[PDB]
PDB file of C-alpha atoms in Angstrom:
ATOM      1  CA  UNK S 637    -129.009 -23.331   4.923  1.00 58.30           C
ATOM      2  CA  UNK S 638    -127.545 -21.814   2.408  1.00 56.25           C
ATOM      3  CA  UNK S 639    -124.048 -22.765   0.005  1.00 58.35           C
ATOM      4  CA  UNK S 640    -121.174 -22.947   3.134  1.00 58.89           C
ATOM      5  CA  UNK S 641    -123.778 -22.638   5.805  1.00 56.42           C
ATOM      6  CA  UNK S 642    -124.538 -26.213   7.108  1.00 55.24           C
ATOM      7  CA  UNK S 643    -121.822 -26.394   9.886  1.00 52.13           C
ATOM      8  CA  UNK S 644    -122.953 -21.725  11.172  1.00 56.11           C
ATOM      9  CA  UNK S 645    -125.041 -24.472  14.516  1.00 55.84           C
ATOM     10  CA  UNK S 646    -122.411 -26.385  15.470  1.00 56.52           C
ATOM     11  CA  UNK S 647    -119.575 -23.581  14.822  1.00 56.34           C
ATOM     12  CA  UNK S 648    -121.906 -21.446  17.140  1.00 56.91           C
ATOM     13  CA  UNK S 649    -121.816 -24.030  20.273  1.00 56.40           C
ATOM     14  CA  UNK S 650    -118.709 -24.303  19.635  1.00 58.76           C
ATOM     15  CA  UNK S 651    -117.433 -20.726  20.786  1.00 56.43           C
ATOM     16  CA  UNK S 652    -120.466 -20.253  23.263  1.00 57.66           C
ATOM     17  CA  UNK S 653    -122.407 -18.277  21.254  1.00 54.91           C
ATOM     18  CA  UNK S 654    -125.225 -20.498  19.383  1.00 55.65           C
ATOM     19  CA  UNK S 655    -127.994 -18.286  21.516  1.00 55.78           C
ATOM     20  CA  UNK S 656    -127.009 -16.141  18.356  1.00 57.29           C
ATOM     21  CA  UNK S 657    -128.061 -19.004  15.385  1.00 58.01           C
ATOM     22  CA  UNK S 658    -131.269 -17.266  14.410  1.00 58.66           C
ATOM     23  CA  UNK S 659    -129.104 -14.322  13.015  1.00 58.18           C
ATOM     24  CA  UNK S 660    -127.686 -16.811  10.707  1.00 56.96           C
ATOM     25  CA  UNK S 661    -131.015 -17.026   9.168  1.00 56.12           C
ATOM     26  CA  UNK S 662    -131.809 -17.166   5.699  1.00 56.08           C
ATOM     27  CA  UNK S 663    -127.312 -15.323   5.998  1.00 56.71           C
ATOM     28  CA  UNK S 664    -125.078 -16.479   2.727  1.00 55.12           C
ATOM     29  CA  UNK S 665    -121.553 -17.189   3.583  1.00 57.14           C
ATOM     30  CA  UNK S 666    -120.943 -13.928   1.529  1.00 58.30           C
ATOM     31  CA  UNK S 667    -122.430 -11.921   4.250  1.00 59.55           C
ATOM     32  CA  UNK S 668    -121.067 -13.537   7.779  1.00 60.46           C
ATOM     33  CA  UNK S 669    -117.849 -12.235   6.189  1.00 59.02           C
ATOM     34  CA  UNK S 670    -119.321  -8.405   6.154  1.00 57.97           C
ATOM     35  CA  UNK S 671    -120.178  -8.743   9.862  1.00 58.63           C
ATOM     36  CA  UNK S 672    -118.581  -6.667  12.455  1.00 59.34           C
ATOM     37  CA  UNK S 673    -119.669  -5.317  15.583  1.00 61.06           C
ATOM     38  CA  UNK S 674    -121.236  -2.743  15.139  1.00 62.30           C
ATOM     39  CA  UNK S 675    -123.941  -4.440  12.886  1.00 61.41           C
ATOM     40  CA  UNK S 676    -123.879  -6.479  15.338  1.00 65.54           C
ATOM     41  CA  UNK S 677    -124.368  -4.648  18.648  1.00 70.45           C
ATOM     42  CA  UNK S 678    -127.707  -3.026  16.219  1.00 74.70           C
ATOM     43  CA  UNK S 679    -129.445  -5.492  15.583  1.00 77.69           C
ATOM     44  CA  UNK S 680    -129.787  -6.239  19.522  1.00 80.66           C
ATOM     45  CA  UNK S 681    -125.890  -8.776  20.162  1.00 83.49           C
ATOM     46  CA  UNK S 682    -124.582  -7.753  24.065  1.00 82.03           C
ATOM     47  CA  UNK S 683    -122.108  -5.221  23.186  1.00 82.69           C
ATOM     48  CA  UNK S 684    -119.652  -8.569  24.936  1.00 84.04           C
ATOM     49  CA  UNK S 685    -120.709 -10.451  21.721  1.00 84.55           C
ATOM     50  CA  UNK S 686    -120.676  -8.718  19.100  1.00 88.01           C
ATOM     51  CA  UNK S 687    -117.068  -8.877  19.763  1.00 89.53           C
ATOM     52  CA  UNK S 688    -115.873 -12.406  20.723  1.00 87.25           C
ATOM     53  CA  UNK S 689    -118.325 -12.487  18.039  1.00 88.08           C
ATOM     54  CA  UNK S 690    -116.553  -9.545  15.366  1.00 93.00           C
ATOM     55  CA  UNK S 691    -112.952 -11.600  16.714  1.00 92.91           C
ATOM     56  CA  UNK S 692    -114.550 -15.221  15.652  1.00 93.76           C
ATOM     57  CA  UNK S 693    -115.260 -13.213  12.183  1.00 93.52           C
ATOM     58  CA  UNK S 694    -112.713 -11.754  11.795  1.00 93.40           C
ATOM     59  CA  UNK S 695    -110.089 -14.992  12.740  1.00 89.43           C
ATOM     60  CA  UNK S 696    -112.404 -17.070   9.589  1.00 90.54           C
ATOM     61  CA  UNK S 697    -110.996 -14.097   6.878  1.00 89.36           C
ATOM     62  CA  UNK S 698    -106.909 -15.601   8.020  1.00 90.64           C
ATOM     63  CA  UNK S 699    -108.171 -19.002   7.406  1.00 91.96           C
ATOM     64  CA  UNK S 700    -106.118 -19.054   4.188  1.00 93.41           C
ATOM     65  CA  UNK S 701    -103.149 -17.567   5.645  1.00 93.48           C
ATOM     66  CA  UNK S 702    -102.865 -19.349   8.964  1.00 93.88           C
ATOM     67  CA  UNK S 703    -103.829 -22.913   6.527  1.00 94.87           C
ATOM     68  CA  UNK S 704    -100.716 -21.111   4.364  1.00 95.37           C
ATOM     69  CA  UNK S 705     -98.497 -20.714   7.056  1.00 97.99           C
ATOM     70  CA  UNK S 706     -98.841 -24.212   8.586  1.00100.83           C
ATOM     71  CA  UNK S 707     -98.993 -26.061   5.328  1.00101.41           C
ATOM     72  CA  UNK S 708     -95.246 -24.005   4.870  1.00101.15           C
ATOM     73  CA  UNK S 709     -93.612 -24.498   8.333  1.00101.96           C
ATOM     74  CA  UNK S 710     -94.594 -28.178   8.457  1.00 99.99           C
ATOM     75  CA  UNK S 711     -93.127 -28.884   4.747  1.00100.18           C
ATOM     76  CA  UNK S 712     -90.060 -26.862   6.565  1.00 98.19           C
ATOM     77  CA  UNK S 713     -89.935 -28.459  10.132  1.00 99.33           C
ATOM     78  CA  UNK S 714     -90.377 -24.767  11.700  1.00100.69           C
ATOM     79  CA  UNK S 715     -93.032 -25.995  13.079  1.00100.37           C
ATOM     80  CA  UNK S 716     -94.474 -29.574  15.326  1.00 98.18           C
ATOM     81  CA  UNK S 717     -96.736 -31.706  14.422  1.00 96.50           C
ATOM     82  CA  UNK S 718     -98.650 -30.813  18.024  1.00 98.78           C
ATOM     83  CA  UNK S 719     -98.775 -26.928  17.272  1.00 98.89           C
ATOM     84  CA  UNK S 720    -100.115 -28.150  13.440  1.00 98.92           C
ATOM     85  CA  UNK S 721    -102.587 -29.786  14.775  1.00 98.80           C
ATOM     86  CA  UNK S 722    -103.527 -27.035  17.556  1.00 98.86           C
ATOM     87  CA  UNK S 723    -104.582 -24.034  14.919  1.00101.38           C
ATOM     88  CA  UNK S 724    -106.784 -27.202  12.571  1.00101.58           C
ATOM     89  CA  UNK S 725    -108.647 -28.271  16.490  1.00102.62           C
ATOM     90  CA  UNK S 726    -110.041 -24.010  15.526  1.00102.26           C
ATOM     91  CA  UNK S 727    -111.114 -24.905  11.732  1.00101.66           C
ATOM     92  CA  UNK S 728    -112.066 -28.172  11.916  1.00101.82           C
ATOM     93  CA  UNK S 729    -115.720 -26.589  13.191  1.00 98.28           C
ATOM     94  CA  UNK S 730    -115.957 -23.341  11.216  1.00 97.31           C
ATOM     95  CA  UNK S 731    -118.228 -22.012   7.892  1.00 97.51           C
ATOM     96  CA  UNK S 732    -116.133 -24.233   4.412  1.00101.91           C
ATOM     97  CA  UNK S 733    -117.656 -23.442   1.329  1.00102.77           C
ATOM     98  CA  UNK S 734    -117.576 -26.647  -0.806  1.00102.63           C
ATOM     99  CA  UNK S 735    -114.351 -27.545  -3.320  1.00102.32           C
ATOM    100  CA  UNK S 736    -116.043 -26.653  -6.098  1.00103.25           C
ATOM    101  CA  UNK S 737    -116.228 -23.060  -5.504  1.00101.63           C
ATOM    102  CA  UNK S 738    -114.927 -21.349  -8.236  1.00 99.50           C
ATOM    103  CA  UNK S 739    -112.074 -19.208  -6.677  1.00 98.47           C
ATOM    104  CA  UNK S 740    -107.774 -18.846  -6.794  1.00 96.56           C
ATOM    105  CA  UNK S 741    -107.701 -23.175  -4.570  1.00101.86           C
ATOM    106  CA  UNK S 742    -105.351 -20.142  -2.609  1.00101.25           C
ATOM    107  CA  UNK S 743    -107.996 -19.389  -1.374  1.00101.64           C
ATOM    108  CA  UNK S 744    -110.318 -22.389  -1.309  1.00104.23           C
ATOM    109  CA  UNK S 745    -110.807 -22.908   2.657  1.00105.70           C
ATOM    110  CA  UNK S 746    -112.117 -26.012   2.044  1.00105.32           C
ATOM    111  CA  UNK S 747    -109.068 -27.595   0.225  1.00103.63           C
ATOM    112  CA  UNK S 748    -106.548 -25.649   1.255  1.00104.44           C
ATOM    113  CA  UNK S 749    -107.649 -27.355   4.874  1.00102.55           C
ATOM    114  CA  UNK S 750    -107.036 -30.745   2.988  1.00102.32           C
ATOM    115  CA  UNK S 751    -103.975 -30.212   2.238  1.00106.63           C
ATOM    116  CA  UNK S 752    -102.863 -29.601   5.666  1.00108.22           C
ATOM    117  CA  UNK S 753    -104.246 -32.447   6.877  1.00108.18           C
ATOM    118  CA  UNK S 754    -102.377 -34.351   3.942  1.00110.03           C
ATOM    119  CA  UNK S 755     -98.733 -33.012   5.344  1.00110.30           C
ATOM    120  CA  UNK S 756    -100.076 -33.413   8.763  1.00110.54           C
ATOM    121  CA  UNK S 757    -100.780 -36.861   8.307  1.00113.34           C
ATOM    122  CA  UNK S 758     -97.498 -37.360   6.254  1.00113.11           C
ATOM    123  CA  UNK S 759     -94.977 -36.143   8.566  1.00110.72           C
ATOM    124  CA  UNK S 760     -97.020 -38.335  10.817  1.00107.05           C
ATOM    125  CA  UNK S 761     -96.331 -41.955   9.941  1.00106.51           C
ATOM    126  CA  UNK S 762     -92.715 -40.405   9.259  1.00105.26           C
ATOM    127  CA  UNK S 763     -91.842 -39.149  13.153  1.00108.34           C
ATOM    128  CA  UNK S 764     -90.246 -42.062  14.476  1.00106.63           C
ATOM    129  CA  UNK S 765     -91.854 -41.615  18.319  1.00101.03           C
ATOM    130  CA  UNK S 766     -94.943 -39.974  15.829  1.00103.08           C
ATOM    131  CA  UNK S 767     -96.835 -42.687  17.431  1.00103.94           C
ATOM    132  CA  UNK S 768     -95.333 -41.703  21.190  1.00100.17           C
ATOM    133  CA  UNK S 769     -97.550 -38.497  21.322  1.00 97.27           C
ATOM    134  CA  UNK S 770    -101.152 -39.916  22.859  1.00 96.78           C
ATOM    135  CA  UNK S 771    -102.650 -36.495  23.010  1.00 96.70           C
ATOM    136  CA  UNK S 772    -101.835 -34.686  19.793  1.00 95.38           C
ATOM    137  CA  UNK S 773    -102.549 -37.872  17.357  1.00 91.87           C
ATOM    138  CA  UNK S 774    -106.111 -38.247  19.347  1.00 88.00           C
ATOM    139  CA  UNK S 775    -106.419 -34.725  18.823  1.00 89.32           C
ATOM    140  CA  UNK S 776    -106.123 -35.453  15.046  1.00 93.31           C
ATOM    141  CA  UNK S 777    -108.064 -38.828  15.366  1.00 98.77           C
ATOM    142  CA  UNK S 778    -111.554 -36.443  16.631  1.00 96.43           C
ATOM    143  CA  UNK S 779    -110.128 -34.114  13.733  1.00 93.40           C
ATOM    144  CA  UNK S 780    -110.248 -36.230  10.782  1.00 98.17           C
ATOM    145  CA  UNK S 781    -113.370 -37.209  12.755  1.00101.37           C
ATOM    146  CA  UNK S 782    -115.447 -33.497  12.005  1.00 97.66           C
ATOM    147  CA  UNK S 783    -113.635 -33.518   8.636  1.00 97.44           C
ATOM    148  CA  UNK S 784    -115.848 -36.984   7.604  1.00 99.55           C
ATOM    149  CA  UNK S 785    -118.361 -35.724   8.447  1.00 97.31           C
ATOM    150  CA  UNK S 786    -118.129 -32.055   7.194  1.00 99.55           C
ATOM    151  CA  UNK S 787    -120.703 -31.222   4.236  1.00103.11           C
ATOM    152  CA  UNK S 788    -117.546 -29.974   2.113  1.00102.71           C
ATOM    153  CA  UNK S 789    -115.553 -32.471   2.357  1.00100.70           C
ATOM    154  CA  UNK S 790    -119.523 -34.551   1.016  1.00 99.00           C
ATOM    155  CA  UNK S 791    -117.088 -36.210  -1.722  1.00 99.52           C
ATOM    156  CA  UNK S 792    -113.632 -36.576   0.301  1.00100.20           C
ATOM    157  CA  UNK S 793    -115.082 -38.251   3.017  1.00101.48           C
ATOM    158  CA  UNK S 794    -113.906 -41.553   1.600  1.00103.61           C
ATOM    159  CA  UNK S 795    -110.270 -40.560   0.882  1.00104.33           C
ATOM    160  CA  UNK S 796    -111.326 -39.379   5.189  1.00108.42           C
ATOM    161  CA  UNK S 797    -112.245 -41.819   6.152  1.00111.24           C
ATOM    162  CA  UNK S 798    -109.267 -43.973   5.292  1.00113.30           C
ATOM    163  CA  UNK S 799    -106.929 -42.205   6.569  1.00115.53           C
ATOM    164  CA  UNK S 800    -107.968 -41.880   9.674  1.00114.57           C
ATOM    165  CA  UNK S 801    -108.237 -46.264   9.339  1.00112.58           C
ATOM    166  CA  UNK S 802    -104.152 -46.250   8.742  1.00114.33           C
ATOM    167  CA  UNK S 803    -103.808 -43.837  11.334  1.00112.05           C
ATOM    168  CA  UNK S 804    -105.508 -45.653  13.739  1.00113.17           C
ATOM    169  CA  UNK S 805    -104.119 -48.780  13.091  1.00114.28           C
ATOM    170  CA  UNK S 806     -99.929 -47.047  13.534  1.00114.49           C
TER     171      UNK S 806
END
């Protein structure tokens, strides 16, 4: 697989679409983002899966805005941690290019994702009852878990394990 596509299989499995793993064979990250429902129907994907995958690809394109929004609303106190962690859950397994990918930092998905993780874990440790929310804390630990193994975060794995360790001891 090419840059940013090492997690394509796990992502598809998460959407119950791993049946189409071969479609991505030598596809580049940029090509994946050019996928349309029309293209999928044309290459043998059922109309149902074509629509669903097209929707998922569209959501991939919204990641930067979603992360930007979560960052903002958490900093303003408008968004609950449970909500922020739910949003992250739907992004953590998506195909992400390495942090070292040149371009506007604001559009660097991996970077925005790690930024939100910092805000979340920081807001958490400052919440007197944070420890009492077993559900939210459990999802977050799973997120850190999947992030530690995301090749795009290769050079941050150490910091992530540390963070996850700190939280496990609250």
